[PDB]
Ligand binder design. Structure first.
Ligand SMILES: OC[C@H]1NC[C@H](O)[C@@H](O)[C@@H]1O
Length: 436
C-alpha cells in the first residue's frame, strides 16, 4: 500500500474554453480561442468551443459527478471575457453569476475550489491591443485579477495566476499553433516577460485584497533525457520547464541557457522588471504528461522517437518523470508547497456493449504516476495535492474533440456523461487516500 499524508488534496481539473461552450452567452466578449478556432485551418476537423461539453448549462450535473466520486478539489478556470467582455473596464454581472453558482455549489458539497485565472482564453478586445505582447497587459491582468479577488476571494482561497505560460508564449506566438496564431520569436519572448510581469502584479493585488488565501502559478514540464553521453537536456529543462519562470521569480533573472539562446529576443532593459517579478508566491503547480529523448541538432535541439508505450497524443509514457520533476523543483528552488495540477492521458476510448468504458490503459497510466508522486513525498517534496486532467473529455485545443483525456466520457451527440473505469478507480484512490 501507498498512503498519502492526511489532508492531501485529490482533485480533477478542467479549463473554461475546453468544457463550457456558449462562448458568447449572457454578454460574454469573444476570446482569442473563439476567433482562432473559427479561422479555417487552425483546429483539427474545424472543431470549435461553441458547444464543447455544454458545461455552461450542465455544470450542476458535472459537479454532482465530482461529489459522487468523492473527489476533494476541483481545479477550473475562469473565462476572462465572460467577466470583462472588453478585457478591462465593464464587468459583466452574468459572468460573475455563472462562477458564483459553481463556487457556492462546490463549497456546499465540501469540494475545495482551485481557480485558474488565465487558462488561455484572452479577451479578443485585448488581442487587438497586442495581447501578451503589450507591456500594458500587466495592468489589464491586475485589474481582471482584482475583480475576481473582490468578488470570489471571500470563498475561493486557492488561486493560480497563469496556466502554462511557456505554451501561451511559445506555442501561441512562435509556433503559431495556438491562439493568437503568431510566428514571431521577438513577440514570443516579450510575451514570456509580460506573462511574468502580469503574474507578479496579480500576486501583489492578491496580498492587498484576499489577506487569508494562497496564490501560485502552473507550468508545463517534460522529462527530458539525453540520447547519448546532456547540454541539450539542460537547455530543454531550463526553457520548456518551470525554470524559465521560477528563475526570475526566485533568483531575479532568466536561466543561463535561456539567456544564451534568447537574450536578443527579450526587451533591452528586461532586468528593470525583475525585482517586481520576484513577488512572493505560495505554491508551485506542475503539470506533467510525457518524457522526451533529446539530442543536439545543428533551436539546436530535436526529439528522438523511442519504443515505449505512447498515448493517443503520441506522448511517451514515462512515469518516473513525475518523480524527477518533483525532486528537481525542490532541489532547484525549494518552494514551500507544490501541487501536481495536471497529469493524465489521451486514449482512444470506446463505450463497450456493457455501457462502460474499460480504460485500463488510463488506469495503468494514472496508477504509475501517483506511485511516483508518493515516492517524492517520502523523500521530502512538499506535495500537497494531485489533480487529474481531466474530469471530462473536452476540446483539446488544436486537436479539437479528437483527443479524450477525461475520466468521464462525453458522448457529444447527446452530452451524456459516462464515468470511465479510470474515474471509478480514481474514486477509490481518493476514498483510500492512496494506492493499495
Ligand atoms: O494537452 C493536455 C492538457 N495539457 C495542459 C493544458 O493545461 C490543458 O489545457 C491541456 O488540455
Amino acid at each position: 500500500v501507498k498512503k498519502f499524508p492526511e489532508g492531501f488534496l485529490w482533485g480533477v481539473a478542467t479549463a473554461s474554453y475546453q468544457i463550457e461552450g456558449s462562448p458568447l452567452a449572457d454578454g460574454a466578449g469573444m476570446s482569442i480561442w473563439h476567433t482562432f478556432s473559427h479561422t479555417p485551418g487552425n483546429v483539427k476537423n474545424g472543431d470549435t468551443g461553441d458547444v464543447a461539453c455544454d458545461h455552461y448549462n450542465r455544470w450542476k450535473e458535472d459537479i454532482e459527478i465530482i461529489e459522487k466520486l468523492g473527489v476533494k478539489a476541483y481545479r477550473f478556470s475562469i473565462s476572462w471575457p465572460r467577466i470583462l467582455p472588453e478585457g478591462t473596464g465593464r464587468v459583466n454581472q452574468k459572468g460573475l453569476d455563472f462562477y458564483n453558482r459553481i463556487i457556492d455549489t462546490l463549497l456546499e458539497k465540501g469540494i475545495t475550489p482551485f481557480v485558474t485565472i488565465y487558462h488561455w482564453d484572452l479577451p479578443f478586445a485585448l488581442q487587438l491591443k497586442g495581447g501578451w505582447a503589450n507591456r500594458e497587459i500587466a495592468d489589464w491582468f491586475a485589474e481582471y485579477s482584482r475583480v475576481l479577488f473582490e468578488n470570489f476571494g471571500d470563498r475561493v482561497k486557492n488561486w493560480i495566476t497563469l496556466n502554462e505560460p511557456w505554451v501561451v508564449a511559445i506555442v501561441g506566438h512562435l509556433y503559431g499553433v495556438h491562439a493568437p496564431g503568431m510566428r514571431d520569436i521577438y513577440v514570443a519572448f516579450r510575451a514570456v516577460h509580460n506573462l511574468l510581469r502580469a503574474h507578479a502584479r496579480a500576486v501583489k493585488v492578491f496580498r492587498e485584497t484576499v489577506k487569508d488565501g494562497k496564490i501560485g502559478i502552473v507550468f508545463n514540464n517534460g522529462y527530458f533525457e539525453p540520447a547519448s553521453e546532456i547540454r541539450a537536456v539542460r537547455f530543454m529543462h531550463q526553457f520548456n520547464n518551470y525554470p524559465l519562470f521560477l528563475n526570475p521569480i526566485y533568483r531575479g533573472d532568466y536561466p543561463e541557457l535561456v539567456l544564451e539562446f534568447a537574450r536578443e529576443y527579450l526587451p533591452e532593459n528586461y532586468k528593470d522588471d525583475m525585482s517586481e517579478i520576484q513577488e512572493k508566491i505560495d505554491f508551485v503547480g506542475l503539470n506533467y504528461y510525457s518524457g522526451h529523448l533529446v539530442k543536439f541538432d545543428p533551436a539546436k535541439v530535436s526529439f528522438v522517437e523511442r519504443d515505449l508505450p505512447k498515448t493517443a497524443m503520441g506522448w511517451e509514457i514515462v512515469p518516473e518523470g513525475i518523480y524527477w520533476i518533483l525532486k528537481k523543483v525542490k532541489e532547484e528552488y525549494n518552494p514551500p508547497e507544490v501541487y501536481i495540477t495536471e497529469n493524465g492521458a489521451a486514449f482512444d476510448d470506446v463505450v463497450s456493449e456493457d455501457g462502460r468504458v474499460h480504460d485500463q490503459n488510463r488506469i495503468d497510466y494514472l496508477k504509475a504516476h501517483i506511485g511516483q508522486a508518493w515516492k517524492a513525498i517520502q523523500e521530502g517534496v512538499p506535495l500537497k495535492g494531485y489533480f487529474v486532467w481531466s474530469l471530462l473529455d473536452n476540446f483539446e485545443w488544436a486537436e479539437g474533440y479528437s483527443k479524450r483525456f477525461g475520466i468521464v466520457y462525453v458522448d457529444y451527440s447527446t452530452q451524456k456523461r459516462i464515468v470511465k473505469d479510470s474515474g471509478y478507480w480514481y474514486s477509490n484512490v481518493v476514498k483510500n487516500n492512496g494506492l493499495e
